[PDB]
């Protein structure tokens, strides 16, 4: 009765596609997207952006359970991403691309997030990867914010400034859940889909994809 | 054609008052001075009908005083228009919380297409949010909370001309008004290049002058003039031709000046700082004190003017001997004019040792067009310039001015021109007596179609075949004997004015035979 994409790859499936993962003390599964090529495969995708079909400007309840389709653009859900990183200890990679056709990735050794009474608080560690020297996500953490949750360590309202939902410090150096900007607008836009230490604050990237698999692989 | 100065009585608002005075050097009448908020260069300003009162320390100026404490919704950018003949002109400044969170370290920058520029702000009121950078009130980028530098920089290399305007800087969770403002001016062409394509060169303007990219002439810093801005204008004087006075007993230690767009804004020459409050460190002299004294043989340095050459030496750095160059003066111009309506050849005469060349001499139609010399006489002293108008009519009745602008100064002098219309009589002449060999006639011409004083009356006559006429007339009713026998004759009345165009058509006319 398997619970992520790393298990799907253990069980001999070496292809990327839609699969269905069931979660511990979660009655009732979730279709997800498993990436089996990168590095060594066994990756479990928590969000995919590539075109802007999907609207990321949503509320808690919506960001809690996740939305979009595992096929195209999506978000897994926090009470899922939480329910998945309490089972063990997970690593995190993040797959970027700008409009000039340029991959990049940040990658983190430890990754875990607390619960709903803990505001899905961010706990990362060990930032490696080509997306800048420094971490464009804040590692020590502050709480998760959406349009109806001023949880940021900021005094303003960082949801309703950068659009959607993310880990907002005093508005951190990243927002992969922001505003999708098409080719050409993608220069000098602020509430965009951004990552500071890679392409610059005023960029809106092209194709983000955040993913996890456990350490032990 | 227009001398428009924007005075900012300190662009940093505290609890006290600040004031914007827009001064025009013009005369008869006074083209309506606009002063409004500058909604384009910094969008999302809050709209407020600002009161433009009139200023009375000067000839013509309108001023906007917000009173102490009511300095509320004054954050933003501002402007004043002055205009000319279909042509506009506007000067742009800013006003901001003295507090705020930052300090632009300069209100305007004058930089040339393709220069590396470092648009800065000093960090003042440190808070635990991020820093942010806003041009045209459109977003750019920012600075994460913990790595907030001490001098918030913005680097723009090879700046393009569509890449300028007003820049902001605030602590993210804030007003589009708690910000701090700096203006960036990029001209079409590189320094010392001007023209409609960048294929000409500027009058090289010393003393920090700025070379207009449309005219190749220089917009000079306040207290300097010439075409090359080299002229040591008098103490506590400013403008195009330095006829204006700083009010304040210590001169201009708090007047932030602002100039036609290709320049930007700056202190009076003698004052360092954001508020011009700061005296200039010795050996420096220009506007903002941005000019360093390279006096060759060690002549004193003046925070206001520059090098104070020993008698018999003149020059930027006392680097030249020669006769002490004298600034031009417009000579043998009278106060009043009155010319009659037609072709017209007006004549400017100007003394001075830089001894004008027709490049440097112009005339200004009351509407405000520049007329250039169609020819040039000269002499030993006084260059002499002559101009031409097609037909001058009575609507050009007003003030015109001689503009002389040499390298060691600019002068202007005016003259009220009252164009008068030609006579032409109203009625026909009426015939008194006929006969075999003569006729007698009432010259009409007391009802006359124009104006003026009538100085000669000439009698016109013909048969039906050719033309002739004449007889300069000395009594209203007239007797032409020595006539044929039976011809048809045609008689016309023709009046005359004061010199030049004084002929002026006839119409009238009857006919007879014997």
Same structural domain, B410 and B489: no
Q: Which domain holds residue B15?
A: 1-98
Domain end residue (candidates: B60, B78, B98): B98
Beta carbons within 8 Å of B182's beta carbon, 6+ residues apart:
B94, B104, B105, B106, B107, B108, B109, B119, B120, B121, B166, B167, B169
Minimal CA separation from A31 to chain B, in Å: 36
HSE (side-chain half, CA atoms, 13 Å) at B251? 19
Task: Tell me which chain A residues have a C-beta less than 8 angstroms from the C-beta of B129.
Answer: 154-156, 170-171
Q: Does B14 map to a domain?
A: yes
The answer to whether the CB atoms of A156 and B173 lie below 8 A apart is yes
Buried b (16+ CB within 10 A) or exposed e, A148-173: ebbbbbbebbbbebbbbbbbbbbbbb
Residue B348 carries which DSSP code?
E
Across the interface, whether the CB atoms of A170 and B139 are under 8 A apart is answered no
Kindly identify which residue of chain A lies nearest to residue B142, measuring between CA atoms: A201
Q: How far is B112 from chain A (nearest CA, A)?
A: 23
Q: Is residue B385 part of a domain?
A: yes
What is the separation of C-alpha B135 from the centre of its chain, rounded to a whole number of angstroms?
A: 30
> Which neighbouring-strand residues pair with A157?
none
Q: Which residues contact B298 (CB under 8 A, 6 or more apart)?
A: none
Q: Determine the Cα–Cα distance for residues B134 and B140; give it in Å rounded to an integer.
A: 6
Residue B157 near residue B116, CB atoms below 8 Å? yes
Contact A155 B145 (CB under 8 A): no
How far does B138 lie from chain A, in Å, by closest CA? Answer: 9
Is A156 in contact with B130 (Cβ distance < 8 A)? no
Residues B367 and B445 placed together within one structural domain of the fold:
no
How many residues are present in chain B? 514
Nearest to A60 by CA among A142, A124, A123, A119: A119
Strand partners, B123: B102
Same structural domain, B45 and B11: yes
Phi, psi of A17 (to 5 degrees): 175, -170
DSSP A53-118: -S-----HHHHHH-EE-SSSSEE--HHHHHHHTTTS-EEEEEEEE-TTS-EEEEEEEEEEE--TTT
CATH number at residue B59: 2.60.40.10
Q: Which CA distances in Å does A186 have to A196, B163, B273, B512?
A: 14, 17, 39, 92
How many whole angstroms separate alpha carbon B209 and alpha carbon B194?
Answer: 14
Chain A CB contacts of B156 under 8 Å are none
**Minimal CA separation from B142 to chain A, in Å:** 7
Chain B residues at the A interface, defined by Cβ less than 8 Å, are 128-130, 138-142, 144-145, 172-174
Q: Is residue B141 part of a domain?
A: no
Interchain pair A170, B141: CB under 8 A: no
Q: Read off the DSSP letter of residue B204.
A: P
Return the bridge partners of A194, or none.
A175
From A62's Cα to the closest Cα of chain B, the distance in A is: 26
Q: Report how far apart, in Å, the C-alpha atoms of B63 and of each of B5, B54, B76, B255 are.
A: 12, 6, 17, 14
Query: Phi-psi region for residue B469, left (φ > 0), alpha (ψ -120 to 50) or beta?
Result: left
Answer yes or no: do B142 and A201 touch at CB < 8 A: yes
| Closest chain A C-alpha to B180 CA, distance in angstroms | 19
Q: Which residues of B touch A201 (CB under 8 A)?
A: 140-142
Pick from B210, B225, B248: which is nearest to B305 by CA?
B225
Count of domains for chain B: 3
Please list the residues that pair with A179 across neighbouring strands: A192
Cα nearest neighbour of A162 on chain B = B172
HEC-encoded secondary structure of A32-43:
EEEECCCCCCCE
- Asked if B140's CB is within 8 angstroms of A170's CB, the reply is no
d(CA B208, CA B219) in angstroms, rounded, equals 10
CB A140 within 8 A of CB A170: no
Instruction: Compute the radius of gyration of chain A from its Cα atoms.
Output: 16
Tokens of A157: 């309202």
B66 lies in the same domain as B89 = yes
Specify if B51 maps to a domain: yes
Which residues of chain B neighbour A142 with C-beta distances below 8 Å? none
Chain B residue numbers touching A200 (CB-CB < 8 A):
141
What domains sit in chain A, N to C, each tagged with a CATH number? Answer: 1-131+207-217 (3.90.215.10), 132-206 (4.10.530.10)
Distances (CA, A) of B186 to B112, B189, B204, B207, B220: 5, 8, 18, 20, 17
- What's the Rg (C-alpha) of chain B? 32
- Residue B503's CB is within 10 A of a number of other CB atoms, namely 17
**Chain B residue numbers touching A169 (CB-CB < 8 A):** 144-145
Residues B385 and B450 in one domain: no
Together in a domain, B371 and B434: no
B128:A170 CB<8 A = yes
Host H or E run for residue A161:
helix A159-162
Inter-chain contact A156–B138, Cβ cutoff 8 Å? Answer: no
Token reading at B186: 């990029």
Answer yes or no: are the C-beta atoms of A210 and A176 closer than 8 Å. Answer: yes
Are residues B6 and B93 both part of a single domain? Answer: yes
Give B286-346 as a DSSP string. Answer: SBTT--B---TT---EETTTEE-PPTTB-STTS--BSS-PPPP-B-S--SB---BSS-B--
Paired with B460 in beta bridges are: B492
> In 3-state terms, what secondary structure has residue B7?
strand
Largest CA distance in chain A: 50
Domain end: B98, B133, B160, which one? B98
The answer to whether residues B12 and B76 belong to one domain is: yes
Shared-domain flag, residues B456 and B505: yes
From the CA of B179, how many Å to the nearest CA of chain A? Answer: 16
Chain B residue nearest residue A157, CA to CA:
B173
Chain B residues in contact with A161 by the CB 8 A cut-off are 172
**B332: burial class by Cβ within 10 Å (0-12, 13-18, 19+)?**
exposed
Distance to chain B for A189, nearest Cα, Å: 7
Q: Are strands B108-112 and B182-187 parallel, antiparallel or unpaired?
A: parallel
* Distance, CA of B144 to CA of A136 (rounded, Å): 9
Asked if residue B203 lies in contact with residue B218, where contact means CB atoms within 8 angstroms, the answer is yes
Please indicate whether, in this complex, the C-beta atoms of B129 and A188 are within 8 angstroms of each other: no
B4 vs B25: CA distance, rounded Å: 7
* Cis ω before B29 (30° cut-off from 0): yes
DSSP for residue B467: -
Phi-psi region of B492 (alpha: psi -120 to 50; beta: other; left: phi over 0): beta
Tokens, residue B374: 């169609």
Which chain A positions have a beta carbon within 8 Å of B142's beta carbon?
190, 201
The structure tokens 């003394």 sit at B351
Experimental method: X-ray
Residue B190 has phi, psi (to 5 degrees) of -70, 165
3-class SS letters over B373-440: CCEEECCCCCEEEECCECCCCHHHCEEEEEEEEECCEEEEEEEEECCECCCCECCCCEEEECCCCCEE
Rounded distance between C-alpha atoms, residue B218 and residue B220, angstroms: 6
CB contacts of A196 in chain B (<8 Å) are 144
Q: Angle CA(B53)–CA(B57)–CA(B62) in degrees, nearest 5?
A: 25
Which SS3 state, helix, strand or coil, does residue A199 take? helix
Residue B168 lies in a domain: no
Is residue B355 in some structural domain?
A: yes
Cβ–Cβ gap A200/B141 under 8 Å = yes
With CB atoms and an 8 Å threshold, state whether B144 touches A173: yes
Q: Who's near B478: CB < 8 A, 6+ residues apart?
A: B440, B441, B443, B459, B471
List residues of A whose CB lies inside 8 A of any B CB: 154-156, 161, 169-173, 188-190, 196, 200-202
The one-character DSSP state at B358 is G
Q: What is the 3-state secondary structure (H, E, C) of B127-172?
A: CCCCEEEEEECEEEEEECCCCCCCECCCEECCCCCCCCEEEEEECC
Question: What tokens appear for A199 in the block?
Answer: 């392409």
Where is the domain boundary, B98, B114, B138?
B98
**Of the partner residues A171, A189, A202, the one whose CB lies closest to the CB of residue B130:** A171
Comparing CB atoms, the residue among A171, A188, A196 nearest residue B139 is A188
> Within 13 A of B206's CA, how many CA atoms are on the CB side?
17
Percentages of chain A per state (helix, strand, coil), in multiples of 5: 10, 30, 55
How many beta-carbon pairs under 8 angstroms link A with B? 40
Please give the structure tokens belonging to residue B57.
């320390």
Q: Do A156 and B172 touch (CB under 8 A)?
A: yes
What gap in Å lies between CA B11 and CA B21, rounded to an integer? 12
CA gap A81, A84 in Å, rounded: 5
Say if the Cβ atoms of B141 and A173 lie within 8 Å: no
Q: Is B376 in the same domain as B446?
A: no
Q: What is the distance between the alpha carbons of residues A161 and A171, in angstroms, rounded to a whole number? A: 9
């Amino acid at each position: 009765p398997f619970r992520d994409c790393a298990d799907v790859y253990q069980a001999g499936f070496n292809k990327s596609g839609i699969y269905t993962i069931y979660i511990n003390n979660m009655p009732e599964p979730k279709k997800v997207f498993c990436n089996m090529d990168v590095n060594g495969g066994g990756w479990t995708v928590i969000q995919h952006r590539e075109d802007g079909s999907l609207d990321f400007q949503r509320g808690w309840k919506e960001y809690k359970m996740g939305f979009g389709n595992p096929s195209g653009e999506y978000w897994l859900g926090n009470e899922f991403i939480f329910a998945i990183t309490s089972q063990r200890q997970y690593m995190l990679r993040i797959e970027l691309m700008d409009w000039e056709g340029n991959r990049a990735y940040s990658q983190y050794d430890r990754f875990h997030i607390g619960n709903e009474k803990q505001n899905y608080r961010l706990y990362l560690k060990g930032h490696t990867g080509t997306a800048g020297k420094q971490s464009s996500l804040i590692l020590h953490g502050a709480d998760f914010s959406t349009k109806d949750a001023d949880n940021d360590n900021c005094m303003c309202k960082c949801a309703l400034m950068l659009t959607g939902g993310w880990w907002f410090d005093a508005c951190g150096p990243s927002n992969l859940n922001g505003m999708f900007y098409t080719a050409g607008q993608n220069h000098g836009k602020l509430n965009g889909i951004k990552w500071h230490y890679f392409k610059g604050p005023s960029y809106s990237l092209r194709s983000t994809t955040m993913m996890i698999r456990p350490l032990d692989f | 054609a227009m001398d428009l100065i924007l005075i900012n009585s300190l662009p940093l608002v505290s609890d006290a008052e600040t004031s914007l005075t827009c001064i025009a050097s013009g005369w008869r009448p006074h083209e309506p001075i606009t002063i409004g908020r500058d909604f384009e260069a910094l969008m999302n300003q809050h709209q407020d009908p600002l009161e433009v009162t009139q200023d009375v320390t000067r000839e013509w100026a309108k001023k906007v005083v917000w009173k102490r404490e009511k300095a509320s919704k004054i954050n933003g950018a501002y402007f004043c228009e002055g205009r000319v003949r279909g042509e506009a002109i506007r000067i742009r400044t800013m006003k901001m919380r003295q507090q705020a969170s930052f300090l632009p370290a300069t209100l305007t920058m004058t930089v040339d297409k393709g220069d590396n520029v470092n648009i800065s702000f000093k960090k003042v009121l440190i808070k635990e949010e991020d820093a942010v950078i806003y041009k045209n009130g459109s977003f750019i980028h920012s600075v994460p909370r913990h790595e907030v530098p001490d001098i918030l920089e913005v680097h723009l290399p090879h700046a393009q001309p569509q890449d300028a305007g007003v820049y902001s800087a605030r602590y993210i969770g804030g007003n589009l008004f708690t910000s701090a403002f700096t203006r960036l001016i990029v001209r079409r062409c590189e320094a010392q290049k001007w023209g409609p394509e960048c294929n000409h060169l500027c009058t090289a303007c010393m003393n920090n002058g700025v070379c207009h990219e449309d005219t190749g002439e220089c917009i000079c810093p306040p207290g300097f003039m010439g075409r090359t801005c080299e002229k040591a204008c008098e103490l506590h004087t400013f403008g195009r031709t330095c006829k204006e006075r700083c009010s304040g007993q210590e001169g201009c230690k708090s007047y932030v000046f602002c100039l036609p767009d290709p320049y930007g804004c700056s202190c009076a020459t003698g004052w360092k700082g954001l508020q011009c409050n700061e005296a200039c460190h010795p050996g420096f002299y220009g506007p903002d004190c941005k000019l360093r004294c390279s006096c060759n043989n060690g002549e004193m340095c003046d925070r206001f003017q520059g090098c104070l050459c020993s008698p018999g030496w003149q020059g930027l750095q006392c680097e030249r001997e020669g006769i002490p160059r004298m600034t031009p003066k417009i000579v043998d111009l009278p106060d009043h004019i009155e010319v009659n309506s037609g072709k017209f050849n007006p004549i400017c005469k100007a003394s001075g040792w830089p001894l004008p060349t027709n490049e440097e001499m112009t005339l200004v139609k009351p509407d405000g067009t520049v007329l250039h010399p169609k020819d040039f006489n000269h002499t030993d002293h006084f260059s002499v310039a002559i101009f031409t108008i097609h037909r001058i009519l009575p609507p050009d009745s007003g003030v015109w001015v001689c503009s002389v602008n040499t390298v060691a100064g600019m002068v202007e002098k005016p003259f009220n021109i009252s164009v008068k219309v030609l006579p032409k009589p109203l009625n026909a002449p009426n015939v008194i007596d006929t006969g075999h060999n003569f006729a007698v006639i009432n010259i009409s011409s007391e009802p006359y179609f124009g104006d003026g004083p009538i100085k000669s009356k000439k009698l016109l006559y013909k048969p039906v075949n050719h033309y002739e006429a004449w007889q300069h007339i000395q009594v209203t009713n007239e007797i032409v004997t020595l006539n044929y026998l039976e011809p048809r004759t045609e008689y016309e009345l023709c009046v005359q004015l004061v010199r030049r165009g004084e002929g002026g058509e006839g119409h009238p006319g009857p006919v007879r035979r014997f």
